[PDB]
Every structure is written in C-alpha cells, then in structure tokens.
Amino acid sequence: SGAIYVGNYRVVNRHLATHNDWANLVWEDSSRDLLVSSTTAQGCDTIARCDCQTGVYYCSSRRKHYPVSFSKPSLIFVEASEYYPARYQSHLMLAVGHSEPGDCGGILRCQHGVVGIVSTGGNGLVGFADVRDLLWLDEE
C-alpha cells in the first residue's frame, strides 16, 4: 500500500483506490494503474520534474529502501498478477528488484522528489507507475 500526497491531491494505485477515493475522484487511468482523488488537507510531497533514471524505492515486503536504475516510462507487457491479467501497462518504468503485490504504492524518489509508485512485480523486476508527466499535480 501507499500514496503520494501533493497539494490537495492523493495519488494511489487504481487497483487499491477506496470508495472515498472514487467519491472524490480527480482523474484515473486503468492503463497506468493510477487514480488521483481530492483531499481536504494539503500534502507535502514534491513530484519530481525531471528525466532521472536513478533513484531509491521503498519495498515494504523487505522493510528496505533500495537504490535502483529504472527505465524510461514506456508501454510494457506485464504478466498476470493477483490484481490484473497479463496486459500492456502504460507510463511504466522497470528496475531489477523485488516487488510483491503488497509493495504497490511504495515511493520511488530521486533528487527532485517523487518519481512514481510501485505498480508491478515478478520475474525479478519491479515496475513503477510514473507521475512526472502529470504537471497539473503541481497546481489548482
């Protein structure tokens, strides 16, 4: 589990969104596994605005943060997981690393802020849903 809290936005994996998230929806995209809901309280996370390909992610199933290199956001074929069939997922970045379903929502961060959240795992790879292109998170 996990979210990003920026301004009056909460960013979560679409497959983990709550009723309250859907009841306060701003934007969602199944192909990216993202959903954004509105918040009453201001959040303090900063979204990275950059093309970094190195950073650190949180892996809850190891209670550890791992430094990783990660690929550019792309349309990637993902094998079946416990929460999606095998399919193409968009805006996804891969690294070599551990990721199980409970790790979804863990933050990937670079020097500029939050890059994205864990979304995929298996075959020794971890996939992150990028948020750096969602420039509207920075305003309004």
52 appears as a binding residue in the annotation: yes
Q: Rounded to whole angstroms, how far apart are CA atoms 116 and 69?
A: 13
Q: Which of 21, 59, 104, 130 is catalytic?
A: 104
| Residues in region 47-86 near Zn ion by CB under 5 A | 48, 50, 52
Q: Which of 21, 33, 103, 130 is catalytic?
A: 33
- Who's near 140: CB < 8 A, 6+ residues apart? none
76 HSE (CA, 13 A, CB side): 23
Q: Rounded to whole angstroms, how far apart are CA atoms 120 and 117?
A: 9
59 appears as a binding residue in the annotation: no
Question: Known catalytic residue: 15?
Answer: yes
**Is the CB of 52 or the CB of 125 nearer to Zn ion?**
52
Question: Known catalytic residue: 33?
Answer: yes
**Is the CB of 65 or the CB of 112 nearer to Zn ion?**
112
71 three-class SS: coil
Among the candidate windows 64-72, 78-86, 90-98, 104-112, which touches Zn ion by CB under 5 A? 104-112
Q: Rounded to whole angstroms, how far apart are CA atoms 140 and 105?
A: 24
Catalog residues that contact Zn ion under the rule CB under 5 A: 48, 50, 52, 110, 112
Task: Give catalytic residues, as residue numbers.
Answer: 15, 33, 104
